[PDB]
Design a protein around this ligand. Structure first.
Ligand SMILES: CCCCCCCCCCCCCC(=O)O
Ligand SMILES: CCCCCCCCCCCCCC(=O)O
Lengths: 359, 368
């Protein structure tokens, strides 16, 4: 039996924020020379935001302390609509009736409330009240893989059932514009987004149709001594992320050994891979991932594009890249083989081997 | 023939189970008096003698001289999550070890670690520390389940269940850790006073594995026969969880017990029917001991003898409500002492999660 991504959709809040403008706007808020620098190296052109953190209204609110609760409600306010629309689209193409969707996995690291977006999706879409649900929080930029794994196991355990995977990330809702350098960095890289996957099980013999993605092998790797690499926390005025200057190096030395072993277990080499869905969390995250594998820089083309158009949307980013690859073939071969990976908190390398069926 | 692939035919079994809580024992009577000290504080004594709780454990002493200066300050949420991590790690590492202690499973055999909580939230969390502390494989699969409340042990267990049945050679480790004492605030409203009189601290872990139906399992093993979930119509306001500047909180509706009463019977009855059973066939009712009103209505809904809820009352009296952890404390008591002489006791366990979802399972405890 094989696990398949039979449906996929992505969405984003309508508001388009221009980095060139964001830079100017944020700078206005001494050593304001820095801001223009960090926004130039971001390699981001635009990112979507559910909320304009620099809006005259949110400005007063932003400067206030003890506002996480209000911010979590804001998260819910804007997340529900987006996740519903993106989930509806992920299913729009399949015939599956509500009774065939037995699991809903919701992943987020930017909002905490119960009942949450998962409950809203079940009611809004008309899914079974008896559908299984799991909410994956604080697994960061790599959550889509942890989520997909849960759906993969589910579907393999219940071959006649389908799973819905929804990743929602609304960073704009936690904007604070603090003084430190790390805060200035994430505020220049993070964006808003949503994506959903419809997973199913299929016989090996079944001839799948074009566009379908077979999840061949998933993998995880807690990297020794890198715990300070990616930190997530909850502050009185919002959720934060604290990236370590050592992260890109942790990435340079951690990606290659992991990927190489996993491929070898599948009789493949790095030079055999057609697609490299590298998590576009930032110029250096991509930069060092490519350097670790020693592959051509162009192989990360799809990853840079996503970063350029949406910035880092956390767990969502990886699925946008996958969509790009499902939409635009990189060769004329039937079936393209790719590898996807992103990085989680304890600094865990998370990924999968996958096949995109071209014809 | 594009039919669906054949389903795994193995059954998930809880092969290891451990329980644990911080060492500090808080006496409910003393708690009432000490909280009462914080016009007409008559409100405290009532909302305490009606709790049906004798003791509960706490990693932190909320009324301690130190914390009473920190307890009243705003914007302390970040420090409280660090407080959570500091106390959660030692306790979770210890309980996880106790659950694996008797099994011959080598580290490479444990392929999944599910961690559930609704009282923490931190970057590398408790899950990472467990793998490092117990020397689990760096490549183990991990899933963190937050804010699914009092019924999270079921969502977590279901995840381990699918994993194990999909990969029959591996085992899964489930860990529920709840540290309420870390979020103590002592606000004015009844809901807050009520929560602070009911919530306690605790930890529990399960070791899951796949088993072939003809295998003669040994006494104490628990077979997870069937699981179920049910979102109850128009009950969103029943169990509300949120994050405040001074800590995580839970807001319960006056209508909750009414949602429980009319929600339990229909779901439990439908699920048992799927397994050729009725409510009267069941030995053991592991009802989530969230509080007197929750146990109360669950039993009425089922139309069963109050004595069939002894295990649940016992846990509530000795530990208070430890959220996701409580259901597992309940299961351990049923394991340690048979309720009848029949070989193989059949039971149903269930708890309530936000949105108000009935979460539960049908199970078998092998006596001989
Ligand atoms: C789990 C980590 C959450 C990090 C949230 C960071 C929120 C601030 C950055 C995103 C919004 C930027 C808005 C702007 O600067 O124009
Ligand atoms: C996810 C729900 C979190 C609820 C946290 C409630 C914290 C206050 C109650 C627990 C501490 C009680 C301390 C006491 O009064 O003795």
């Amino acid at each position: 039996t094989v696990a398949v991504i039979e449906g996929l959709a992505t969405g984003t809040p309508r508001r388009v924020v221009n980095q060139s403008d964001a830079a100017d706007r944020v700078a206005e808020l001494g050593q304001r020379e820095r801001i223009p620098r960090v926004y130039q190296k971001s390699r981001i052109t635009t990112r979507r935001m559910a909320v304009d953190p620099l809006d005259a209204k949110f400005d007063v609110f932003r400067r206030e302390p003890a506002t996480i609760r209000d911010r979590m409600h804001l998260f819910y306010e804007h997340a529900v609509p987006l996740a519903v629309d993106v989930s509806k689209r992920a299913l729009a193409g399949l015939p599956y009736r509500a009774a065939e969707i037995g699991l809903l996995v919701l992943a987020t690291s930017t909002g905490f409330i119960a009942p949450g977006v998962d409950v809203a999706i079940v009611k809004e879409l008309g899914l079974s009240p008896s559908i299984s649900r799991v909410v994956v929080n604080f697994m960061g930029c790599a959550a889509a893989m942890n989520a997909l794994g849960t759906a993969t196991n589910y579907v393999r355990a219940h071959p006649a059932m389908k799973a819905l995977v929804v990743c929602i990330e609304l960073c704009s809702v936690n904007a604070v514009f603090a003084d430190d350098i790390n805060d200035v960095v994430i505020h220049s890289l993070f964006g808003d987004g949503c994506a959903a996957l419809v997973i199913g099980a299929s016989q090996v013999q079944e001839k799948l149709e074009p566009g379908k993605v077979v999840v061949r092998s998933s993998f995880s790797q807690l990297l020794d001594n890198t715990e300070d690499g990616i930190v997530l926390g909850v502050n009185h005025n919002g959720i934060t992320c604290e990236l370590s200057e050592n992260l890109p190096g942790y990435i340079f030395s951690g990606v290659a050994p992991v990927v190489t072993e996993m491929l070898w277990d599948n009789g493949l080499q790095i030079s055999d891979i057609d697609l490299w869905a590298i998590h576009p969390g930032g110029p250096k995250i991509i930069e060092q991932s490519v350097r670790s594998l020693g592959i051509s820089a162009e192989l990360a083309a799809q990853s840079w594009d996503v970063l350029a158009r949406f910035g880092n949307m956390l767990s969502v980013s990886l699925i946008f890249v996958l969509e790009t690859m499902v939409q635009q073939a990189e060769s004329a071969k039937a079936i393209s083989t790719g590898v996807a990976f992103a990085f989680g908190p304890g600094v865990t390398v998370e990924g999968m081997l996958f096949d995109i069926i071209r014809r």
